[PDB]
Amino acid sequence: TLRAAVFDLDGVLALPAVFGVLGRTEEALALPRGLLNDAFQKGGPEGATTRLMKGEITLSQWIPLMEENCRKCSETAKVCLPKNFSIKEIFDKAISARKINRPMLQAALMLRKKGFTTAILTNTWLDDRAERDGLAQLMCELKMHFDFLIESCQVGMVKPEPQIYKFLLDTLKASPSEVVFLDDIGANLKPARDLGMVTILVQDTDTALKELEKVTGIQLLNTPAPLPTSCNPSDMSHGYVTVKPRVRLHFVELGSGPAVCLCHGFPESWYSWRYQIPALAQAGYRVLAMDMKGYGESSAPPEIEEYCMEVLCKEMVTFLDKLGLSQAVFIGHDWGGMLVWYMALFYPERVRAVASLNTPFIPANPNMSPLESIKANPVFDYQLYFQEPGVAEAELEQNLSRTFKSLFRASDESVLSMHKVCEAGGLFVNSPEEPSLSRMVTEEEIQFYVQQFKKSGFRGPLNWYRNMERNWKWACKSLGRKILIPALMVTAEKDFVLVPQMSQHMEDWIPHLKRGHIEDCGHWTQMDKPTEVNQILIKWLDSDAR
Amino acid sequence: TLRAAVFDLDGVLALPAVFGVLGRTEEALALPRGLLNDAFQKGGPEGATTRLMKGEITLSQWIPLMEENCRKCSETAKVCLPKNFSIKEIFDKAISARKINRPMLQAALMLRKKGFTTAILTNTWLDDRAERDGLAQLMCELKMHFDFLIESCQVGMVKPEPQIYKFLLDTLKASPSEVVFLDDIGANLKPARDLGMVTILVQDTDTALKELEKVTGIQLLNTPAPLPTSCNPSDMSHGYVTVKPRVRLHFVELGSGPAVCLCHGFPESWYSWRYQIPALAQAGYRVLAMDMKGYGESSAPPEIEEYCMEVLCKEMVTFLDKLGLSQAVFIGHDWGGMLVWYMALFYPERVRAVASLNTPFIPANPNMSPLESIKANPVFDYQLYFQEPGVAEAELEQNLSRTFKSLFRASDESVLSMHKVCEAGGLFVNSPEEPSLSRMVTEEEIQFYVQQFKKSGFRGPLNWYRNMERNWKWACKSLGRKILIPALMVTAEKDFVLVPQMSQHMEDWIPHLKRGHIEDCGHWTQMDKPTEVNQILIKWLDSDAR
Ligand SMILES: O=C(Nc1ccc([N+](=O)[O-])cc1)N1CCS[C@@H](c2ccccc2)C1
Numbered sequence A, B: 001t002l003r004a005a006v007f008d009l010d011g012v013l014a015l016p017a018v019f020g021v022l023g024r025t026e027e028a029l030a031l032p033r034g035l036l037n038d039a040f041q042k043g044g045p046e047g048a049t050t051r052l053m054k055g056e057i058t059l060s061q062w063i064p065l066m067e068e069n070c071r072k073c074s075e076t077a078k079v080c081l082p083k084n085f086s087i088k089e090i091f092d093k094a095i096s097a098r099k100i101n102r103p104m105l106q107a108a109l110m111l112r113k114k115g116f117t118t119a120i121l122t123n124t125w126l127d128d129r130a131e132r133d134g135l136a137q138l139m140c141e142l143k144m145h146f147d148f149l150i151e152s153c154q155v156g157m158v159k160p161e162p163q164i165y166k167f168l169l170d171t172l173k174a175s176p177s178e179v180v181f182l183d184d185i186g187a188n189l190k191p192a193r194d195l196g197m198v199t200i201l202v203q204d205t206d207t208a209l210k211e212l213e214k215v216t217g218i219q220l221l222n223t224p225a226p227l228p229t230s231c232n233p234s235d236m237s238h239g240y241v242t243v244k245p246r247v248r249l250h251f252v253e254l255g256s257g258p259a260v261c262l263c264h265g266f267p268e269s270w271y272s273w274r275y276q277i278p279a280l281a282q283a284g285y286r287v288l289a290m291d292m293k294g295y296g297e298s299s300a301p302p303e304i305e306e307y308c309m310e311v312l313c314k315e316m317v318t319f320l321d322k323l324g325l326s327q328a329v330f331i332g333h334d335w336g337g338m339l340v341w342y343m344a345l346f347y348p349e350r351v352r353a354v355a356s357l358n359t360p361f362i363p364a365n366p367n368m369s370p371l372e373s374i375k376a377n378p379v380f381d382y383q384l385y386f387q388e389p390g391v392a393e394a395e396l397e398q399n400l401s402r403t404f405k406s407l408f409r410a411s412d413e414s415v416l417s418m419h420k421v422c423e424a425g426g427l428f429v430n431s432p433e434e435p436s437l438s439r440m441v442t443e444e445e446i447q448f449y450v451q452q453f454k455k456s457g458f459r460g461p462l463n464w465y466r467n468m469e470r471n472w473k474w475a476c477k478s479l480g481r482k483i484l485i486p487a488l489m490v491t492a493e494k495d496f497v498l499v500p501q502m503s504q505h506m507e508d509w510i511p512h513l514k515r516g517h518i519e520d521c522g523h524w525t526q527m528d529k530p531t532e533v534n535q536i537l538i539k540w541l542d543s544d545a546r
C-alpha cells in the first residue's frame, strides 16, 4: 500500500523543463540537432555537469566549462556557433521562464492532505548568478508544501546513482513498494523501478495524473478548486512590540516588500487572516497580521478608555515607530475596518493605502448622540447588550467552543439573530448547547480560538464597543476632512450587520474610492470567501499600493 | 533652573525652512515681494492655513484654497501669476529639500543625555500627498530622540494661541522658568516669553546654540563627535521563529527595505549590533539582529553536534523559509563571520551579499586534521582550553560581570592573553577579581550581557568550538568552489586573534572581494569603532547589496 509520493522538479513540478531549452535553442539558432544537449552531458559521470549537480562547483564556475564543451562539440560536428553565443543568457531566460506546474502541485497537496509523505528529489546546482533570487523564490514557494526536499548539490549524490535512491528511502522511512516516484527522465526512473518503487514517466501532466490517481486510488484530476494555503501557528514568525509600559502588541510576520498591516475584527485573531497571509506574502508583500489590543498574545488591560479609537490608533502609530516603518498599507475587517478608516483620517502620512472588508466609512453625525444613532437601527440591538460591563463577558466566556461555533457560521448555516438580544436576555438564548460545525472552520481551528481567548476573555474585546461617546467626539474633529490617499471598500452581499447599502455614500468623503464586492458572502469574509478576498486584495495592492 | 528644552521643527530642527521657499519662489519667478507669503497667511486666525495647521482639513484640500488666495493677492497687486503656476510642485520640492539640522539635533541629544526633558512643538499639517512618505520618514527619524512631539494638527491648537503653550507646560510637567523654547518665528516666541520661559530666536544655528549653551551651562558647540544611536532593548520589536521542535531563534527587527541578517560572535548577543541596528535601518534596510543558537532568548540545546556549521547554517536557511524571505544579506562578526562565509558557500541562492568583520575566509586543508592546524598557531591555545566539556563553562559562569568586563576591552586596556591559557589553567587566572570598566561599555550594558547569559550560560556558546572535525569534513566538500556573490572583508588592525594578515589570500577564492579596514580597532569591532563600521557597511550595502 502506497504512503509516499516523490516528485522531480524539472519537467514535473516546474515547466517548461530547463532541459528542453537546449533543444529549443538548437532549433532557433539552426544548429545541428542535439549539439547543445550533447555538450551539456559531455564526460557523463566525470563531466562538468555531474560535478555541478553533485555540488563540487557552482553554476557560475560551470558556465565557462559548458561553453568549452559547446565549442568541442561544434568542432566535431564541423559547424560554427553564432557570434553572440552565450550560455549564461540561455540559462538566465530558461530559469526565468520556468514556473510551477500548478496541477502537479495541487495533486501533491491533495496526496499530503490524504496522509501521504511527499518529497521533491532533484538534480540541481548551487546558484550564484546575479539573478539567482528568481529560482530561490520558486524553490521557496514549492518546498513549503512538501515533507522533504532532497537536492543533489546538497547531498553530493546524483540521479541515476543508486545511492541517492537508498538515501531517499532512508529519509522517507519507507520501503520501496510504499513509494510512487514521478520523473520526466526515463533513465532516472529506472533505479527506482529496479528497487520496486511504483514509477510514473511524466510527459504531459494530465496522463501522469491519471496514472497517479489510478495507482493511489485518490481523485486528483477534475477535483474542486482547493482553498488557498492556510497558516500553521507554530510555523510562523511571532513578533512582539511594547507600545507603552503595560501594553504590548503581538503580530505574525511573513514575506518581503511593502508592509501590509492586517487588522481583525470582533471577537477574532491574527488567525482570521490565515488564508490571506501566505497569498499576500507570495504576491510580494511583507505581511504583519496583528492580534489587536485585547486579543490573543497582545495585552488586554481592563479599563474601558484603553479601547477608544484615539488610543488604539495612537498605539498602532507607536507600533510602526518601534518597528522603524514610516508607512504600512492598512487592511481591516469589522472593528479593524473601523480603525483603518480612522488611521487614514488622522495619520494619512503613515498610511500607504487603506482597505476595509465590510465596514463602511460613515462620518459622525454632530447633531445626534451615538446612542440615538445605534438605537435607530434594529440590527444594532446587540450593541446595547454589550454596554454593561460583565454581562456579555459572562455569556461569551461560559462555553468558549459554543461561542465560536455559534458566531462563526456561513450565511446559509442559521447564522444568529442580532435583534431583540436585550429582550431575549442574551446572544445564545435561542441557540443550541452543542452547535454544529460550520463548513468554514475545522474543529482544530475552533480550538485555536478557544485557546487564544482562555488568556484574557472578552473584557478587552467588548471594551471596543464601550467608547461610543469618546469615539464620536474624536471623530467630529475630522468632519471637514476628506480621505484622499488610495482606498478600497469591499462589500459582502449577505453580511446582515454590515450591509452593502450602508457604504453607498462613501464617495462623498472618499472621491477616488475603489470597490470590491463579494456575492454569497456573510460577515466572516476572510474564511467565507478566501479565494475572492485574495484576488480583490492582490489586484488592488499591485495597482494602488506599490 | 532649566530642565526642559523645546524645539520648533521648521527653521530650527529641519532646514531650509519650508516657509522660506515662498520668498525664494517670488524671487525666482520675479513676482511682487511677499505676494506668496501674503496669500499663505490670508484670513489670519480664520484663514485656510490656520484650518490646515489645526487639522480641520488636510494638505491636499488646502492646496486649491492657497491657489485661490494667490490669485486674489495677484489681482490686488495688479500682477499676473505664471502660466504653469503650481502650489503642489512648490511644496513638493520645498518639503523634499528640507533635511534635519544635524548640529541642532546633536544639541537636543546632548541636553537629553544630561537629564533634560526635550520636546518638539510644531505647527504642522495632515499630509495626504502622494509623496507624503518623505516627511513621514523625516518625522520618524527626528521624533525618536525626543520625549514628546506636539503637532498643532493633532492637538487642534496653533502657535501663537496661548492654549498650546499651556498644553506644552502640562505635557512637560514643568513650570515656565524651567523651560527653554527655541523658535525661528519671533511672534511664536512671544507667548512663551510672556509666560516666563527662556526663549531663543533662531536665525543661524551657531548663534542659537551659543545662546543655548550660555543659558543651560552645557557645552553644545565644538563638542566631540558623538557615538551613533544605540538600542534600548525594551523599545525593540522582538521576533521568534521555531526552526525545529526543540529550537527557536530570537531576533530584533528594525526598518524596511532589503533584509540584512546580523550574526554575532562569541560570547555575544544581538545587542553587540546596538550601534549598527538604528543606522542600517535609517540607511533603508530591514535589519534582523539575531541571538545566535545557544544565546540570549534563542534555544540552547546541550548537545555538541547541535552546533556544527552544517546544522547552524541549515537552521538559518529554515529561519529565512519561515519568515518568507527568499534572500538576506548576511553580515557576521567573529563566529558569526565564519557562519556567513559558509552560508555564501553552501546556500548562495539565499545570500543576497555577504560581509565579515574580522573573520577571514580560509579554506579547509584536506591534508591536515583541524587540531594540528589550531595547535600550529600559539594565539589559538585558548581553543584547546574550550574543548573539554564543563571546564571553560565553570570559569566563564563563576562571575558573569567579571567575565564580560575582562573580555570586552579596547586594544589599549590590558586586553587578556590568549597564549598558554591551558598551561596557566584558565582565561582569568592572571586577571583581577574586579576588572575596571572599559570605555567601550557602560555598567548597564555589561549587566544586559550578565542577564542574558543567566538563562543558558556558556555550554551552547562553547559548543561552537567543539565541532572542529565535523566542520572540517563538511568544509572539504566545498574545496572546488569559489565565492562569486558580492562579498566584503573588514579587517581590524589590533585584533590579535583575527589578525588582518590572516585574510591576505582570500582573493584566490573570492576574486571580486571588496575590503574595509579599521585602524586602532581591537576584536570588539562593533563597539570599538561603531562610526567607522557603520560607514563601511552602509557604503558597501548601497553599492553592492541593493
Ligand atoms: O458590531 C460590529 N460587528 C460585529 C462583529 C461580530 C459580531 N458577532 O456577533 O460576532 C457582531 C457584530 N461592528 C464592528 C464594525 S463597525 C461597528 C459599529 C460601530 C459604531 C456604529 C455602528 C457600527 C459594529
Ligand SMILES: O=C(Nc1ccc([N+](=O)[O-])cc1)N1CCS[C@@H](c2ccccc2)C1
Pocket (backbone or CB within 6 Å): B265, B266, B267, B334, B335, B338, B359, B374, B407, B497
Ligand atoms: O575564537 C574565536 N574568536 C574569539 C572570540 C572571543 C574570544 N574571547 O576571548 O572573548 C576569543 C576568541 N574564533 C571565532 C572566529 S573564527 C574561529 C576559528 C575557528 C577555526 C579555526 C580558526 C579560528 C575562532
